[PDB]
Amino acid sequence: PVKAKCIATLAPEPLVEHKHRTLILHLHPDHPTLLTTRSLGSDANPTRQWIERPTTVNFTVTGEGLEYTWGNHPPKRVWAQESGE
Amino acid sequence: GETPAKIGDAKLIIGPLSSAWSPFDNKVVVYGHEVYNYDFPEYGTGKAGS
């Protein structure tokens, strides 16, 4: 057994949607995709869920940031400061 | 309620009916034979996947 880099997986890109300190994400994979995040406060408040059924989800993003992992697609990151004026 | 139809020998005027429930909604999608009273988003807008 060797450390080959398999030609490997990739899940379709997400639909990013803005709200006030909140990411609505209409999402639509090919296969069951383990999504997960890390609210970068010292309060981690992570989430995990395999997604195979297309699902609009939500994420209470904080002031300092959140990150977002659409499958083995690379991890995203997001500034959600205010939007409530 | 003013239309006759002189087919046969009798002249007959019908309605207007009082029960104006169009079972169709305002917005409708249609597919082959199955009709869906769906709030289709619009031409020109529909979100991908949706």
Side-chain angles (χ1 to χ4, degrees):
Chain A
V2 297
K3 183 62 70 176
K5 292 185 264 73
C6 292
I7 59 138
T9 71
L10 189 283
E13 295 293 333
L15 279 297
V16 178
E17 183 64 25
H18 179 275
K19 296 293 181 184
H20 178 76
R21 293 180 293 174
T22 301
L23 294 175
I24 294 167
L25 298 173
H26 181 76
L27 297 167
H28 181 75
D30 292 331
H31 295 89
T33 300
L34 183 63
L35 181 63
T36 183
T37 62
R38 291 183 60 251
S39 68
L40 299 176
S42 296
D43 188 359
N45 192 2
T47 61
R48 279 85 63 197
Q49 63 185 359
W50 292 97
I51 297 168
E52 68 280 19
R53 291 183 292 113
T55 301
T56 302
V57 299
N58 272 310
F59 293 98
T60 301
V61 181
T62 185
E64 64 273 20
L66 182 63
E67 68 178 7
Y68 181 77
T69 60
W70 182 251
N72 62 3
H73 188 271
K76 293 180 177 68
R77 291 180 185 273
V78 65
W79 65 73
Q81 63 182 352
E82 66 176 6
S83 297
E85 294 179 354
Chain B
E2 66 278 19
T3 301
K6 184 177 183 293
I7 302 298
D9 291 329
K11 182 174 72 67
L12 72 167
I13 297 91
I14 295 93
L17 59 85
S18 66
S19 61
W21 292 270
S22 296
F24 292 170
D25 292 332
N26 189 0
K27 291 182 183 179
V28 177
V29 178
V30 175
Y31 182 75
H33 295 285
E34 293 179 353
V35 173
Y36 295 161
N37 60 3
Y38 182 76
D39 184 78
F40 63 93
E42 187 60 27
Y43 182 77
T45 186
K47 301 293 187 292
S50 67

PDB file of all heavy atoms in Angstrom, chain A residues 53-79:
ATOM      1  N   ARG A  53     -28.906  14.777   0.192  1.00  0.00           N
ATOM      2  CA  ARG A  53     -30.110  15.403  -0.304  1.00  0.00           C
ATOM      3  C   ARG A  53     -29.883  16.906  -0.394  1.00  0.00           C
ATOM      4  O   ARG A  53     -29.370  17.499   0.560  1.00  0.00           O
ATOM      5  CB  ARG A  53     -31.287  15.104   0.601  1.00  0.00           C
ATOM      6  CG  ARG A  53     -31.697  13.650   0.539  1.00  0.00           C
ATOM      7  CD  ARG A  53     -32.909  13.369   1.382  1.00  0.00           C
ATOM      8  NE  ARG A  53     -32.599  13.501   2.808  1.00  0.00           N
ATOM      9  CZ  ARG A  53     -33.070  14.439   3.632  1.00  0.00           C
ATOM     10  NH1 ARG A  53     -33.903  15.394   3.225  1.00  0.00           N
ATOM     11  NH2 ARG A  53     -32.689  14.419   4.901  1.00  0.00           N
ATOM     12  N   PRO A  54     -30.208  17.549  -1.511  1.00  0.00           N
ATOM     13  CA  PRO A  54     -30.011  18.997  -1.604  1.00  0.00           C
ATOM     14  C   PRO A  54     -30.794  19.731  -0.537  1.00  0.00           C
ATOM     15  O   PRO A  54     -31.960  19.430  -0.281  1.00  0.00           O
ATOM     16  CB  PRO A  54     -30.521  19.325  -3.004  1.00  0.00           C
ATOM     17  CG  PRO A  54     -30.341  18.073  -3.732  1.00  0.00           C
ATOM     18  CD  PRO A  54     -30.646  17.002  -2.799  1.00  0.00           C
ATOM     19  N   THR A  55     -30.134  20.697   0.087  1.00  0.00           N
ATOM     20  CA  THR A  55     -30.662  21.313   1.290  1.00  0.00           C
ATOM     21  C   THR A  55     -30.186  22.747   1.380  1.00  0.00           C
ATOM     22  O   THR A  55     -28.992  23.022   1.248  1.00  0.00           O
ATOM     23  CB  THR A  55     -30.216  20.533   2.527  1.00  0.00           C
ATOM     24  OG1 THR A  55     -30.671  19.179   2.422  1.00  0.00           O
ATOM     25  CG2 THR A  55     -30.769  21.148   3.807  1.00  0.00           C
ATOM     26  N   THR A  56     -31.127  23.647   1.614  1.00  0.00           N
ATOM     27  CA  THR A  56     -30.797  24.999   2.023  1.00  0.00           C
ATOM     28  C   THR A  56     -30.513  24.989   3.517  1.00  0.00           C
ATOM     29  O   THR A  56     -31.386  24.636   4.315  1.00  0.00           O
ATOM     30  CB  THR A  56     -31.933  25.958   1.686  1.00  0.00           C
ATOM     31  OG1 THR A  56     -32.192  25.909   0.277  1.00  0.00           O
ATOM     32  CG2 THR A  56     -31.575  27.384   2.056  1.00  0.00           C
ATOM     33  N   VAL A  57     -29.298  25.374   3.887  1.00  0.00           N
ATOM     34  CA  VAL A  57     -28.845  25.346   5.272  1.00  0.00           C
ATOM     35  C   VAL A  57     -28.597  26.762   5.751  1.00  0.00           C
ATOM     36  O   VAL A  57     -28.774  27.728   5.001  1.00  0.00           O
ATOM     37  CB  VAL A  57     -27.582  24.489   5.439  1.00  0.00           C
ATOM     38  CG1 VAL A  57     -27.870  23.078   5.035  1.00  0.00           C
ATOM     39  CG2 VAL A  57     -26.435  25.050   4.644  1.00  0.00           C
ATOM     40  N   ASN A  58     -28.173  26.889   7.003  1.00  0.00           N
ATOM     41  CA  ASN A  58     -27.929  28.185   7.599  1.00  0.00           C
ATOM     42  C   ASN A  58     -26.758  28.088   8.557  1.00  0.00           C
ATOM     43  O   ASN A  58     -26.462  27.020   9.099  1.00  0.00           O
ATOM     44  CB  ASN A  58     -29.173  28.700   8.307  1.00  0.00           C
ATOM     45  CG  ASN A  58     -30.080  29.472   7.362  1.00  0.00           C
ATOM     46  OD1 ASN A  58     -29.581  30.358   6.676  1.00  0.00           O
ATOM     47  ND2 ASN A  58     -31.382  29.160   7.288  1.00  0.00           N
ATOM     48  N   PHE A  59     -26.083  29.217   8.736  1.00  0.00           N
ATOM     49  CA  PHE A  59     -24.914  29.290   9.603  1.00  0.00           C
ATOM     50  C   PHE A  59     -24.886  30.668  10.236  1.00  0.00           C
ATOM     51  O   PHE A  59     -24.686  31.666   9.539  1.00  0.00           O
ATOM     52  CB  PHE A  59     -23.639  29.038   8.825  1.00  0.00           C
ATOM     53  CG  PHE A  59     -23.514  27.655   8.310  1.00  0.00           C
ATOM     54  CD1 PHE A  59     -23.847  27.367   7.013  1.00  0.00           C
ATOM     55  CD2 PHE A  59     -23.072  26.640   9.121  1.00  0.00           C
ATOM     56  CE1 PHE A  59     -23.735  26.091   6.529  1.00  0.00           C
ATOM     57  CE2 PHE A  59     -22.960  25.368   8.643  1.00  0.00           C
ATOM     58  CZ  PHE A  59     -23.290  25.091   7.345  1.00  0.00           C
ATOM     59  N   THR A  60     -25.060  30.717  11.547  1.00  0.00           N
ATOM     60  CA  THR A  60     -24.943  31.977  12.259  1.00  0.00           C
ATOM     61  C   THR A  60     -23.480  32.368  12.298  1.00  0.00           C
ATOM     62  O   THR A  60     -22.753  31.975  13.213  1.00  0.00           O
ATOM     63  CB  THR A  60     -25.506  31.849  13.672  1.00  0.00           C
ATOM     64  OG1 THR A  60     -26.882  31.465  13.606  1.00  0.00           O
ATOM     65  CG2 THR A  60     -25.397  33.161  14.440  1.00  0.00           C
ATOM     66  N   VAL A  61     -23.041  33.132  11.324  1.00  0.00           N
ATOM     67  CA  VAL A  61     -21.673  33.619  11.329  1.00  0.00           C
ATOM     68  C   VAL A  61     -21.563  34.741  12.341  1.00  0.00           C
ATOM     69  O   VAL A  61     -22.486  35.539  12.531  1.00  0.00           O
ATOM     70  CB  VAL A  61     -21.233  34.078   9.929  1.00  0.00           C
ATOM     71  CG1 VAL A  61     -19.800  34.570   9.950  1.00  0.00           C
ATOM     72  CG2 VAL A  61     -21.305  32.941   8.988  1.00  0.00           C
ATOM     73  N   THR A  62     -20.411  34.805  12.975  1.00  0.00           N
ATOM     74  CA  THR A  62     -20.116  35.779  14.004  1.00  0.00           C
ATOM     75  C   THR A  62     -19.395  36.967  13.394  1.00  0.00           C
ATOM     76  O   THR A  62     -19.273  37.095  12.176  1.00  0.00           O
ATOM     77  CB  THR A  62     -19.284  35.147  15.116  1.00  0.00           C
ATOM     78  OG1 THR A  62     -19.110  36.096  16.173  1.00  0.00           O
ATOM     79  CG2 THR A  62     -17.907  34.698  14.601  1.00  0.00           C
ATOM     80  N   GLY A  63     -18.885  37.836  14.258  1.00  0.00           N
ATOM     81  CA  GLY A  63     -18.192  39.012  13.776  1.00  0.00           C
ATOM     82  C   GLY A  63     -16.839  38.686  13.185  1.00  0.00           C
ATOM     83  O   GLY A  63     -16.469  39.215  12.134  1.00  0.00           O
ATOM     84  N   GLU A  64     -16.090  37.798  13.835  1.00  0.00           N
ATOM     85  CA  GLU A  64     -14.694  37.617  13.466  1.00  0.00           C
ATOM     86  C   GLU A  64     -14.520  36.703  12.264  1.00  0.00           C
ATOM     87  O   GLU A  64     -13.598  36.919  11.470  1.00  0.00           O
ATOM     88  CB  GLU A  64     -13.880  37.108  14.660  1.00  0.00           C
ATOM     89  CG  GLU A  64     -14.224  35.732  15.213  1.00  0.00           C
ATOM     90  CD  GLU A  64     -15.325  35.771  16.245  1.00  0.00           C
ATOM     91  OE1 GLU A  64     -16.078  36.765  16.274  1.00  0.00           O
ATOM     92  OE2 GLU A  64     -15.438  34.810  17.032  1.00  0.00           O
ATOM     93  N   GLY A  65     -15.368  35.703  12.106  1.00  0.00           N
ATOM     94  CA  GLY A  65     -15.337  34.910  10.893  1.00  0.00           C
ATOM     95  C   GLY A  65     -15.829  33.498  11.113  1.00  0.00           C
ATOM     96  O   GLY A  65     -15.969  33.018  12.236  1.00  0.00           O
ATOM     97  N   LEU A  66     -16.084  32.831   9.989  1.00  0.00           N
ATOM     98  CA  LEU A  66     -16.404  31.416   9.934  1.00  0.00           C
ATOM     99  C   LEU A  66     -15.673  30.821   8.744  1.00  0.00           C
ATOM    100  O   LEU A  66     -15.239  31.547   7.848  1.00  0.00           O
ATOM    101  CB  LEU A  66     -17.909  31.185   9.791  1.00  0.00           C
ATOM    102  CG  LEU A  66     -18.422  29.746   9.770  1.00  0.00           C
ATOM    103  CD1 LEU A  66     -18.111  29.105  11.064  1.00  0.00           C
ATOM    104  CD2 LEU A  66     -19.889  29.684   9.523  1.00  0.00           C
ATOM    105  N   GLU A  67     -15.493  29.504   8.757  1.00  0.00           N
ATOM    106  CA  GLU A  67     -14.969  28.801   7.596  1.00  0.00           C
ATOM    107  C   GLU A  67     -15.897  27.655   7.235  1.00  0.00           C
ATOM    108  O   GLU A  67     -16.706  27.196   8.043  1.00  0.00           O
ATOM    109  CB  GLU A  67     -13.537  28.300   7.808  1.00  0.00           C
ATOM    110  CG  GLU A  67     -13.314  27.203   8.806  1.00  0.00           C
ATOM    111  CD  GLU A  67     -11.849  26.799   8.846  1.00  0.00           C
ATOM    112  OE1 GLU A  67     -11.028  27.478   8.192  1.00  0.00           O
ATOM    113  OE2 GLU A  67     -11.521  25.782   9.484  1.00  0.00           O
ATOM    114  N   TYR A  68     -15.744  27.193   5.997  1.00  0.00           N
ATOM    115  CA  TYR A  68     -16.775  26.445   5.299  1.00  0.00           C
ATOM    116  C   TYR A  68     -16.113  25.458   4.352  1.00  0.00           C
ATOM    117  O   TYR A  68     -15.243  25.844   3.568  1.00  0.00           O
ATOM    118  CB  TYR A  68     -17.671  27.417   4.539  1.00  0.00           C
ATOM    119  CG  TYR A  68     -18.780  26.788   3.790  1.00  0.00           C
ATOM    120  CD1 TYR A  68     -19.903  26.349   4.448  1.00  0.00           C
ATOM    121  CD2 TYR A  68     -18.715  26.644   2.422  1.00  0.00           C
ATOM    122  CE1 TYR A  68     -20.939  25.771   3.769  1.00  0.00           C
ATOM    123  CE2 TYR A  68     -19.743  26.066   1.723  1.00  0.00           C
ATOM    124  CZ  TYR A  68     -20.854  25.618   2.405  1.00  0.00           C
ATOM    125  OH  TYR A  68     -21.914  25.040   1.740  1.00  0.00           O
ATOM    126  N   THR A  69     -16.528  24.190   4.425  1.00  0.00           N
ATOM    127  CA  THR A  69     -15.790  23.077   3.820  1.00  0.00           C
ATOM    128  C   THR A  69     -16.711  22.207   2.978  1.00  0.00           C
ATOM    129  O   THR A  69     -17.128  21.132   3.406  1.00  0.00           O
ATOM    130  CB  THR A  69     -15.140  22.268   4.893  1.00  0.00           C
ATOM    131  OG1 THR A  69     -16.150  21.751   5.762  1.00  0.00           O
ATOM    132  CG2 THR A  69     -14.187  23.113   5.691  1.00  0.00           C
ATOM    133  N   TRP A  70     -16.947  22.620   1.739  1.00  0.00           N
ATOM    134  CA  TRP A  70     -17.851  21.902   0.848  1.00  0.00           C
ATOM    135  C   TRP A  70     -17.169  20.642   0.344  1.00  0.00           C
ATOM    136  O   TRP A  70     -16.688  20.558  -0.786  1.00  0.00           O
ATOM    137  CB  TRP A  70     -18.269  22.786  -0.305  1.00  0.00           C
ATOM    138  CG  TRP A  70     -19.201  22.108  -1.191  1.00  0.00           C
ATOM    139  CD1 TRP A  70     -18.955  21.662  -2.444  1.00  0.00           C
ATOM    140  CD2 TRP A  70     -20.542  21.742  -0.884  1.00  0.00           C
ATOM    141  NE1 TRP A  70     -20.072  21.062  -2.955  1.00  0.00           N
ATOM    142  CE2 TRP A  70     -21.060  21.093  -2.011  1.00  0.00           C
ATOM    143  CE3 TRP A  70     -21.356  21.911   0.228  1.00  0.00           C
ATOM    144  CZ2 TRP A  70     -22.361  20.615  -2.061  1.00  0.00           C
ATOM    145  CZ3 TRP A  70     -22.650  21.439   0.181  1.00  0.00           C
ATOM    146  CH2 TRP A  70     -23.138  20.797  -0.955  1.00  0.00           C
ATOM    147  N   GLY A  71     -17.153  19.635   1.189  1.00  0.00           N
ATOM    148  CA  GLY A  71     -16.469  18.443   0.774  1.00  0.00           C
ATOM    149  C   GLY A  71     -14.977  18.712   0.717  1.00  0.00           C
ATOM    150  O   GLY A  71     -14.476  19.698   1.253  1.00  0.00           O
ATOM    151  N   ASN A  72     -14.268  17.844   0.001  1.00  0.00           N
ATOM    152  CA  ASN A  72     -12.837  18.038  -0.173  1.00  0.00           C
ATOM    153  C   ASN A  72     -12.500  19.216  -1.068  1.00  0.00           C
ATOM    154  O   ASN A  72     -11.315  19.476  -1.286  1.00  0.00           O
ATOM    155  CB  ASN A  72     -12.189  16.767  -0.707  1.00  0.00           C
ATOM    156  CG  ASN A  72     -12.698  16.365  -2.063  1.00  0.00           C
ATOM    157  OD1 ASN A  72     -13.511  17.052  -2.683  1.00  0.00           O
ATOM    158  ND2 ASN A  72     -12.214  15.227  -2.536  1.00  0.00           N
ATOM    159  N   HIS A  73     -13.496  19.904  -1.607  1.00  0.00           N
ATOM    160  CA  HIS A  73     -13.278  21.251  -2.098  1.00  0.00           C
ATOM    161  C   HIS A  73     -12.613  22.069  -0.992  1.00  0.00           C
ATOM    162  O   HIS A  73     -12.904  21.841   0.189  1.00  0.00           O
ATOM    163  CB  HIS A  73     -14.609  21.881  -2.501  1.00  0.00           C
ATOM    164  CG  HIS A  73     -14.477  23.187  -3.203  1.00  0.00           C
ATOM    165  ND1 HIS A  73     -14.434  24.388  -2.532  1.00  0.00           N
ATOM    166  CD2 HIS A  73     -14.380  23.481  -4.516  1.00  0.00           C
ATOM    167  CE1 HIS A  73     -14.318  25.371  -3.407  1.00  0.00           C
ATOM    168  NE2 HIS A  73     -14.281  24.847  -4.619  1.00  0.00           N
ATOM    169  N   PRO A  74     -11.712  22.999  -1.310  1.00  0.00           N
ATOM    170  CA  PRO A  74     -10.917  23.621  -0.258  1.00  0.00           C
ATOM    171  C   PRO A  74     -11.777  24.398   0.720  1.00  0.00           C
ATOM    172  O   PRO A  74     -12.919  24.760   0.407  1.00  0.00           O
ATOM    173  CB  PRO A  74      -9.985  24.561  -1.026  1.00  0.00           C
ATOM    174  CG  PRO A  74      -9.897  23.999  -2.347  1.00  0.00           C
ATOM    175  CD  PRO A  74     -11.240  23.441  -2.631  1.00  0.00           C
ATOM    176  N   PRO A  75     -11.258  24.673   1.911  1.00  0.00           N
ATOM    177  CA  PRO A  75     -12.040  25.403   2.906  1.00  0.00           C
ATOM    178  C   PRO A  75     -12.170  26.867   2.533  1.00  0.00           C
ATOM    179  O   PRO A  75     -11.188  27.525   2.186  1.00  0.00           O
ATOM    180  CB  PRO A  75     -11.224  25.226   4.188  1.00  0.00           C
ATOM    181  CG  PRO A  75      -9.862  25.053   3.719  1.00  0.00           C
ATOM    182  CD  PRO A  75      -9.945  24.293   2.444  1.00  0.00           C
ATOM    183  N   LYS A  76     -13.393  27.372   2.612  1.00  0.00           N
ATOM    184  CA  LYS A  76     -13.665  28.782   2.422  1.00  0.00           C
ATOM    185  C   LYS A  76     -13.597  29.498   3.760  1.00  0.00           C
ATOM    186  O   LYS A  76     -13.429  28.891   4.813  1.00  0.00           O
ATOM    187  CB  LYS A  76     -15.031  28.988   1.784  1.00  0.00           C
ATOM    188  CG  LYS A  76     -15.144  28.485   0.385  1.00  0.00           C
ATOM    189  CD  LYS A  76     -16.536  28.749  -0.136  1.00  0.00           C
ATOM    190  CE  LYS A  76     -16.664  28.329  -1.582  1.00  0.00           C
ATOM    191  NZ  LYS A  76     -16.577  26.857  -1.729  1.00  0.00           N
ATOM    192  N   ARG A  77     -13.731  30.816   3.709  1.00  0.00           N
ATOM    193  CA  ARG A  77     -13.684  31.665   4.881  1.00  0.00           C
ATOM    194  C   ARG A  77     -14.562  32.866   4.580  1.00  0.00           C
ATOM    195  O   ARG A  77     -14.795  33.189   3.414  1.00  0.00           O
ATOM    196  CB  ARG A  77     -12.246  32.071   5.186  1.00  0.00           C
ATOM    197  CG  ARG A  77     -11.367  30.936   5.673  1.00  0.00           C
ATOM    198  CD  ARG A  77      -9.951  31.380   5.957  1.00  0.00           C
ATOM    199  NE  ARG A  77      -9.072  30.272   6.321  1.00  0.00           N
ATOM    200  CZ  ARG A  77      -8.900  29.788   7.549  1.00  0.00           C
ATOM    201  NH1 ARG A  77      -9.551  30.278   8.595  1.00  0.00           N
ATOM    202  NH2 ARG A  77      -8.064  28.782   7.732  1.00  0.00           N
ATOM    203  N   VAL A  78     -15.068  33.520   5.624  1.00  0.00           N
ATOM    204  CA  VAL A  78     -16.064  34.568   5.424  1.00  0.00           C
ATOM    205  C   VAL A  78     -15.987  35.653   6.503  1.00  0.00           C
ATOM    206  O   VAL A  78     -16.050  35.362   7.699  1.00  0.00           O
ATOM    207  CB  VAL A  78     -17.455  33.913   5.348  1.00  0.00           C
ATOM    208  CG1 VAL A  78     -17.850  33.262   6.647  1.00  0.00           C
ATOM    209  CG2 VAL A  78     -18.474  34.894   4.893  1.00  0.00           C
ATOM    210  N   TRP A  79     -15.897  36.922   6.078  1.00  0.00           N
ATOM    211  CA  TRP A  79     -16.120  38.058   6.966  1.00  0.00           C
ATOM    212  C   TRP A  79     -17.616  38.299   6.976  1.00  0.00           C
ATOM    213  O   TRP A  79     -18.225  38.545   5.929  1.00  0.00           O
ATOM    214  CB  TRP A  79     -15.370  39.365   6.599  1.00  0.00           C
ATOM    215  CG  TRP A  79     -15.650  40.187   5.263  1.00  0.00           C
ATOM    216  CD1 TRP A  79     -16.761  40.949   4.997  1.00  0.00           C
ATOM    217  CD2 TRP A  79     -14.738  40.447   4.149  1.00  0.00           C
ATOM    218  NE1 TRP A  79     -16.627  41.586   3.792  1.00  0.00           N
ATOM    219  CE2 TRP A  79     -15.406  41.298   3.252  1.00  0.00           C
ATOM    220  CE3 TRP A  79     -13.447  40.027   3.820  1.00  0.00           C
ATOM    221  CZ2 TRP A  79     -14.830  41.719   2.051  1.00  0.00           C
ATOM    222  CZ3 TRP A  79     -12.887  40.433   2.632  1.00  0.00           C
ATOM    223  CH2 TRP A  79     -13.571  41.279   1.766  1.00  0.00           C
TER     224      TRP A  79
END
